[PDB]
Amino acid sequence: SSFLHIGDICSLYAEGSTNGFISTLGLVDDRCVVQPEAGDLNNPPKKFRDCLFKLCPMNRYSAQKQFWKASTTDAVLLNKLHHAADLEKKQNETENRKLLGTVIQYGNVIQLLHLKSNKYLTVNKRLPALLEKNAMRVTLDEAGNEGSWFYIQPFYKLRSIGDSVVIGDKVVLNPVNAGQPLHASSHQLVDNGCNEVNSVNCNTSWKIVLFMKWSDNKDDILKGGDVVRLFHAEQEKFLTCDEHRKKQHVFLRTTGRQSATSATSSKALWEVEVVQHDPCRWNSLFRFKHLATGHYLAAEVMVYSLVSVPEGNDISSIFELDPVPRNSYVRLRHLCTNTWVHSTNIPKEEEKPVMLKIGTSPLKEDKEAFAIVPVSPAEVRDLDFANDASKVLGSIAGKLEKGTITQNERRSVTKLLEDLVYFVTGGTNSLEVVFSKPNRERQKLMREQNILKQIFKLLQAPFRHICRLCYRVLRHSQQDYRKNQEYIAKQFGFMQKQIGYDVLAEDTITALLHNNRKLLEKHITAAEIDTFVSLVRKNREPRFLDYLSDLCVSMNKSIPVTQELICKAVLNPTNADILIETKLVLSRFEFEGVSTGENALEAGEDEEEVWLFWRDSNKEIRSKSVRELAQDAKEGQKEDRDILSYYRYQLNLFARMCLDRQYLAINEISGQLDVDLILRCMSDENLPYDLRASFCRLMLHMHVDSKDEIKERFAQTMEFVEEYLRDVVCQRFPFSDKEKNKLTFEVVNLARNLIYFGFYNFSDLLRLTKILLAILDCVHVPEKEDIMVMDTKLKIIEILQFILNVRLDYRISCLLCIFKREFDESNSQSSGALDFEHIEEQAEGIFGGSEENTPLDLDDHGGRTFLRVLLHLTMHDYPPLVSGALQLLFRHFSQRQEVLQAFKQVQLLVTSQDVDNYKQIKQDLDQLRSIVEKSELWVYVKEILIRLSKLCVQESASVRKSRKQQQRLLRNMGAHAVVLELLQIPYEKAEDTKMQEIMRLAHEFLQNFCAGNQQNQALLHKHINLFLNPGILEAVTMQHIFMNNFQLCSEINERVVQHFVHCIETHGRNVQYIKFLQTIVKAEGKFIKKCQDMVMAELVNSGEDVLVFYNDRASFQTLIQMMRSERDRMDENSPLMYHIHLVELLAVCTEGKNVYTEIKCNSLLPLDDIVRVVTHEDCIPEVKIAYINFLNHCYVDTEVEMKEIYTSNHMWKLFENFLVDICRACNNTSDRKHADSILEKYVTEIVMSIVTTFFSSPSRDYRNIIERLQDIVSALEDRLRPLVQAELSVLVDVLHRPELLFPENTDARRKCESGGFICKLIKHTKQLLEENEEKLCIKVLQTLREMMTKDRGMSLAEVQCHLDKEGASNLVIDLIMNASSDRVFHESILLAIALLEGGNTTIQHSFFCRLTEDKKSEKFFKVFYDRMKVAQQEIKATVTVNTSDLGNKKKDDEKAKDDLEMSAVITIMQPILRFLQLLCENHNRDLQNFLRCQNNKTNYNLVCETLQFLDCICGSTTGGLGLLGLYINEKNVALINQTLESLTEYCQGPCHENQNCIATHESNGIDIITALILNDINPLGKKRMDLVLELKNNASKLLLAIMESRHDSENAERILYNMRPKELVEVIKKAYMQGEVEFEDGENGEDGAASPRNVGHNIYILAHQLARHNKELQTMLKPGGQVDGDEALEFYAKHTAQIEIVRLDRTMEQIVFPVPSICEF
């Protein structure tokens, strides 16, 4: 019949004197029970997921119960023991898998696993039970033990031992050794109707109720009870059920992350109800229970909308799935209602909301697919184990709140309070802890499952282990977790009082201090004072006092501090002596120098207390430098001495990072520095890991080659250094080097810092470097060893910091001017005009940096407004001291009550290097989003909204990459949501008003049109509108309101934009723009008419932005018939210089009326209206309303037939399109343009384009100057000459391995060779920094020179050697980064990789070989490159193809005036292009094997984009090619041919599906391909000579590759493209006659054969088409026969053509028949 098996999943129903299913009290409490009234057989229980067990085989518990005697002092023997405990724990797994399915026999020895708990049921032999006294305690242990073994032996003798166990059977589970058999009790429990199961001989029998067979393949199958989220495929939004308005509602949630599948919220899951008959285990339906609350899903009252239902039994809650597999992405439908869910966009009371509202729909959409994402059971158990907590505190906090709690409770809750600290740290902290590292997912759970709510709700009203036992948990939960932190500082109005309650509560604050910061200080104020008065009174050793001290950090701290000094000067007494003054202290230090106790013990307290707080003073002195007098440091001890000279330096010269000079100068030298820069750089900058840096050291060891009164302290210094050296003769830096290093540490910063504040411009502070070289070098130079390395580690930042500093900018200043020796003219050894007087004025500016506001005497008067010199030389080439200008800058961030700000400040506004400076400007960026948040809280003392603005624009007029850098997820939606939060209500009347500019400088999306403002939907998604109807509103901000709208929602790419240019204002808008806005503007400014005509432009412009996007799936049909009729109304205006930017914007708005309108017209007179308008114009030169009015006459003259429907006649429109086109020299004699060839030209190929349409109709300055020149001549000469030598040395590295072999001859087996591949693994790790910069780029250089060894001087074993030694796999893993970084080098980056690989495809394969392996890790990254062309593609074609298509001069030939400087611009344009191109070349040079070409089962792998892209420049070119200029344009040709060879290496495999898919997916590209060659070049010349040899050698090879096969389908699509027989025979008689008739070509040209191995490739292609068909027999007759002289020069082919195929044994598995091989003498 039907048995049980290992891996079946069932439930047990007791039937002794008590009946029931066994079950747990949760994941907190580990007790077993049977709640008898919860459920019987007929009426299954409610929460039956807690009464399922899996039959597990018998577990091996030998070496784990031995490792369970952690009696052992040895470490290596506990490691053996546990290793065993582990290996057994597993060997268990393995065997038990094997025992899966196996029929249990009675008296087999089976354990019974608790699923929801996952714990094993266990008898604990050696105990009493809790509720029954004699019975052994039965509990749920996680891992199991021998007392988890239970003979499944029979109860009633209906079956016996041996017999297989049937489903249902009643048995005695009898512990194997743990004694008495299982027995469900008769005693209920204290807190719950539930009985405690215990091990006692009793007459209890167990009914074996099977749940889910062992046939539960998972994770493989969604089977009932699985837990999954239901992602939205389109809305990239999980499905989520919460309360809004105390009301349970379901919703997709909007996430602010940058990865929609990480916005995981416990509130976002669902449990699967594969409906059955009996409650038991792809075609039936399924029900969904909201995991969190317990309710089920249903769509009730679009006909239906998903929302929550409280019991899962009614038939609404019943759904079905549509394409069962895990992680399936299904389309579901509602059963009781037959509707296919469907998402809306309507959300409520909030500002920028998230809970999106969901219905269903009788119509099967396609995009509405849900990913059946499966969730971690462990995750699962997390939520469970947390709920548990929530309720435990639910009872206890509800039970110690209105009274007392028992002693049993405390014991458990504290326990808990323990267990938590345990979970939330991912199992690290606990107690004598060791580490404490937080866990993000579980913290989050704390918040969203209202654990937190409970705790607080628990404290509220002995505590020694509650709070700040609690406050330790919290100290935890907030850690590093910003989101949570914004709680632990505020949480906290308590936790300061509670921060008193615990000597254990200081920790709270301190964690704070470190991570937490800014908001703490606030609530304390002088509260602190009580605590420190208190603490200084109560913390004697002041330890708590002290941790209060090291709590000091950040600038804002110093104040309360000093006041304390006051009370602390109050506190000064100490009853003890610290004295001598030289004498008795040096004694107290000998006395402490004895290791003594008591006395010598106590001492330490003070020292500590001092060093920390003292340093607590930052760059704060005076009151510290006052506080710091005698600068004594003989017994310097631990940097006391040091921190003291440190404050004593805060008292003298703030080193302002001089950096005096500028100009091309700098760069040359950096080159000189060479790699070491790098070396040092990477070591410190990177080699966070000591090693790497260590290396750059190997680099070093190789290298080898109040000024006075401060000095004094110094001398003391250079000694302690030299000292720190001989100690460096001390190699062992063991432990000593805590001390000594520590000491050194401050020192060095210091000393570093030292050199810095006291360097001087002569050989000397320099020679002090020499002794440094010795220092650095003499500076020599796992498990516990990491903690320790810490030191050597800081020992780096500085050693390099140090090393760097000097090394860096210090290194090399003199050489600069020193070579002052003279040039051309007459000797002059150093033996922007007066740059010294605006940098000595600018020193008056450093000087300026110094000051403060209390010097009432010097503050306003003397300094005054230097800005003028600034304003005067804003125009002048930035000086080097502009960062130092910025110095001046930084300060002002403090405030601005005074008004004088603006003046000096505006000098800063005065600048002429926005791009370069602005990138620097972002620095405030956070500070700034303040200044626009503050500057915006008082705008729509004045200089922070205006200077916050000027900042805005100088950025806003900046690089696309600039536009990109706004990245205002942190925080646009808040400079908008907040900037609006006050600026929407607030609008300024004309003419001064400012909300439209700081908002407006932002949307410069390439200065029009509607592209690159994707960010706008969400930010603009989430807002409060502007005003309407009765009444009126405030000027400026409205106008502002309309256009900005356009800019947010003008994306031509998303259908929102129609509903957008419609949502809110819509068609209705038109009406209110008939009257009453003049009234508002009248009232609105003295120049009211200015506000009312800007309203006319706004009201005219709804076409313009994303106008392609406005129309769309259905925009125009809605406004069909109303809006044009409505438009005549505003047909008349005047005085419009402004309003004629509203007739040029009412000539681009008026341009947006009739383009996309093919079939919605039934109205009149529009034409006459426009025409009269263009005639009635006055004012500015026509050129613009003749390009707005000429642009009109073309857009109107093309359509031909639709406009003639539009009116009786357009006869005034060709004497106006022929007066607008005939014209004069401006229209009289302005004489202002000099690219005529380009004008008349783009005009005449635009007039050739127009022709086509019609048929488809329906003393000192000399110093500055001679300097500039010798700089140019020198620069050219020099710069040009040296870099090659530097590239050769850069090549020196490439030796690489052998290099480590020579000199570093590395004995006892050291690792000289193979220095590349690890430096490698290294740098790959290195890009984790957002900025890789020239470091990266310089690498790039050294690789293409790795190509240099074989060229720049075996290569493929170097290509294949890196290959070998960490090769290919890395770089690949890498290039992905080139999105953000490398963007401007990733191009460079690409070229370099490709060279060293190519021609050595073998090593490459090794590459791939490796690569595929990451099948998943591999397949996603795919879609990329694709969209980088693709992306590069559609648009890229557009940009320069069409302006180029109007080509030059399209006016006949026998002041060439060919537009000047064309080549530089196309290079620029073809920058991003060029990226894409070099791409092509690489793509070609790796191809080889088929699976390679096969584009492994990637995520988005459609070669299609290439065709599109190819197709893209092709785009419009069905006939003999008329892009011409674009076709006759150069950069195009290289890009292509490479595409033809890469593409050519793809269909070269001749994949039947390859050749078949292409043309299809391009469904055009192909055809074009065909069309060019039968009009192969009209423009002859060098330019045309290359258009032929490409046009036919690439076409030849490519054509060939696509067609080297047999089917029938893949031939037709290309043929129909050509009048092929005639296009190919008169192109083979016009290329073979054009190419044949000359015969002066170069001979034996390995190189080119063009019109004949081509024209012959014609004859070859034709030859290859004759396999089947009848049409091809047709075009086939002519070579096939003929005496004709053209069929006899064609005969001159067929015989002088090979015209014969080569024999094929067949490659791969005996398959394809044949293909020709040239041999046509």
Ligand SMILES: O=P(O)(O)O[C@@H]1[C@H](O)[C@H](O)[C@@H](OP(=O)(O)O)[C@H](OP(=O)(O)O)[C@H]1O
């Ligand atoms: O940038 P940070 O400081 O890492 O902070 C995260 C950022 O705000 C994410 O947008 C947010 O996800 P959502 O937008 O989906 O909330 C995430 O929340 P989470 O931690 O709750 O996922 C934050 O932790």
